[PDB]
Amino acid sequence: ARVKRGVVAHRRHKKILARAKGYYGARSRVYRVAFQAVIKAGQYAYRDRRQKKRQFRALWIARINAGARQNGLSYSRMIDGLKKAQVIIDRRVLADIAMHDAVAFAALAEKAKGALA
Amino acid sequence: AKLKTRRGAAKRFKATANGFKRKQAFKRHILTKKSAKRIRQLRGCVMVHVSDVASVRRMCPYI
């Protein structure tokens, strides 16, 4: 029972090369180079699925800081005031309101500052 | 082919009901200086230690 390797080997190499579409030079043409490039891409994606949450939280905090300083507070004081006033709205929604509706953010700042007083 | 016994080991070990028995060393010569207690306590057969049983089994497959 002699077994030839061609069809299965060709299919495997072709699947790797298909996942390597768009890369520069030999990384999309040569199997040895393309195979290393796909594994490293997978590792990078795994790590960046964790990095993404940190980056977006930092962005929300920056936009909230800008809104609070326009309304006369700092980010830390505004967060403290809201926590003392029992408001449980999160930073993503607070940043959305800060960017798109200034009057509602001013009302939230008034609530926080009243709680601080 | 067939497994072959190590005849040197076959001349040294014999099988009991649950193990192997052996003779004791240091009783061949230089006996005057040895005390009577050693002379009479090194006489007779003892059992093969559990650490050497496996090797004895590999060396003597049919006993």
């Binding site: - | 060393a25 004895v56 060396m59």
Partner: protein, 144 residues
């Protein structure tokens, strides 16, 4: 049922054999379970049985003892319960050999008390232990 494509072995009767050196996922890839370097990782790598690295071996630092008897190789031992295989009621060396409880090259036999018998036997020219003789007589037999 009962077709050549509807028959299977009992569960647990067959296993796949171990194939070394076929990739990371298999768990026995690369070195194939042999470890890293040394004599045992080479082809035909084991040392001779009884070799202990150079110190005097267990079977050579101990003394030899005894001698081998030749009549013991032709003496035969028979359990009492084995007497039931004998056809007839005469127990002798020839009838034991015919019943195949004794090898054809044994010159004498001994009967020991190991089991039980119910029939009455007559024993001729076969040695008996005290317990075996008591059992044979208690079951109704006799000797010569």
């Amino acid at each position: 049922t009962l077709r050549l494509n509807e028959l299977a072995p009992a569960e647990g009767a067959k296993r796949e054999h171990r194939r070394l050196g076929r990739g990371i996922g298999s768990g026995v890839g690369k070195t194939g379970g042999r470890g890293i370097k040394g004599q045992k990782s080479r082809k035909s790598g084991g040392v001779r049985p009884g070799f202990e690295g150079g110190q005097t071996a267990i079977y050579r630092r101990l003394p030899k003892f005894g001698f081998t008897s030749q009549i013991a190789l032709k003496t035969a031992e028979v359990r009492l319960s084995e007497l039931s295989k004998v056809e007839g009621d005469i127990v002798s060396l020839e009838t034991l050999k015919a019943a195949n409880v004794v090898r054809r090259d044994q010159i004498r036999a001994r009967i020991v008390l190991s089991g039980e018998i119910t029939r009455a036997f007559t024993v001729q020219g076969v040695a008996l232990t005290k317990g075996a003789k008591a059992a044979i007589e208690a079951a109704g037999g006799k000797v010569e």
